[PDB]
């Protein structure tokens, strides 16, 4: 029985690990897909071909962009740009009513997220009713023609809250479905390399635990927390030490190594 120390995947592959050996490994890897859930940091994917990219989603970005474009008109931030004159702006706040800065922006960002015929039909109907176009496709044509850029629309708060809520309920399912796809995507490991497994289920990383479980967050906040977790745990330093209790190659050429902790 040997004592093997390895600081790279290639070193371990050439070491000829056997059951009974003592193994000491340090490097950077990915937690397999506990406060880190959906990750398991007691099992480290250690491979030279880290082909899995961090979870990114054009569809989520389109949803976030739509939500942002509407919120800057219904809930402006300190720095936020106002796209009407100061005087008309000034006049609307003392008025006590709600203005859309930029109707064309909302149409185009909706058309972008909701590109399918069947997506977001209620939101599309709400936008058609605010504009002067016949149907949604006629409105999108004028939007793509540029006829709506910086056009303003005035609506009363009941319609503005119906609109804010329509957008909230149209964007959110895209983000929920994309977080399902993304975590399921991460479940397909690259061929070869190693899977280093704690028999006790102890973590091989020293990473800060999330302050709460992202599964309890609403969709956008959940996606953001998951992107942060993945950014940490898909490229994490790890230290794995113990007695080898099993080693075998799976159908994907990945070598699974079970380690038992040393007292």
């Amino acid at each position: 029985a040997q004592t093997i120390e390895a600081t790279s995947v290639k070193q371990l592959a050439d070491a000829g690990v056997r059951v009974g050996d003592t193994l000491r490994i340090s490097g950077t890897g990915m937690c397999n897909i506990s406060p880190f859930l959906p990750f398991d940091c007691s099992q480290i994917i250690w491979n030279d071909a880290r082909s899995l990219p961090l979870p990114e989603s054009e569809l989520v970005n389109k949803a976030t962009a739509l939500t942002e474009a509407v919120n800057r008109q219904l809930h402006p931030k300190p720095e936020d740009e106002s796209r009407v004159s100061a005087s008309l702006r000034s006049a609307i706040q003392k008025s006590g009513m709600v203005l859309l800065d930029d109707f064309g922006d909302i149409v185009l960002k909706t058309a972008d997220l909701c590109s399918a015929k069947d997506d977001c039909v209620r939101l599309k109907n709400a936008l058609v009713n605010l504009g002067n176009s016949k149907d949604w496709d006629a409105l999108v044509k004028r939007a793509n023609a540029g006829k709506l850029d910086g056009v303003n629309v005035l609506l009363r708060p009941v319609s503005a809250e119906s609109l804010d809520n329509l957008v909230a309920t149209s964007t959110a399912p895209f983000i929920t479905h994309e977080t399902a796809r993304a975590a399921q995507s991460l479940n397909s490991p690259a061929p070869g390399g190693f899977l280093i497994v704690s028999d006790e289920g102890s973590d091989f990383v020293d990473q800060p635990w999330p302050s709460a479980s992202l599964y309890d967050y609403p969709p956008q906040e959940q996606w953001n927390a998951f992107q942060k977790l993945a950014q940490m745990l898909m490229h994490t330093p790890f230290n794995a030490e113990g007695i080898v209790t099993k080693i075998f190659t799976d159908a994907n050429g990945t070598q699974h190594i079970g380690l038992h902790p040393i007292p």
Binding site: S85, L88, A91, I92, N129, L130, V151, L154, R156
Partner: protein, 84 residues
């Protein structure tokens, strides 16, 4: 150039904003005929057409005093609008 007095009257009318406009009517001396708010309105709307306006949302026409050059002054302003 149509004149709207409440924002509520433009609800459901896409429009472009073209900036502030005003009309005025002075009365030089306390002796002279009082300031005419109507004459201010009409100057406002004709200057609205100068900016290629379609309508005006009226902010205010308070009749002020401290204005220099006339005893009391009728200032009357609003936003020039282009209804699509």
């Amino acid at each position: 150039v149509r004149i709207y007095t409440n924002a509520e009257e433009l609800v459901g009318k896409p429009f472009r904003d073209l900036g502030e406009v005003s009309g005025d009517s002075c009365q030089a001396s306390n002796q002279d005929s009082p300031p005419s708010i109507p004459t201010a309105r009409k100057r406002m709307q004709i200057n609205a057409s100068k900016m290629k306006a379609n309508a005006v949302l009226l902010h205010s026409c308070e009749v002020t005093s401290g204005t220099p050059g006339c005893y009391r002054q009728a200032v009357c302003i609003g936003s020039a609008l282009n209804i699509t």
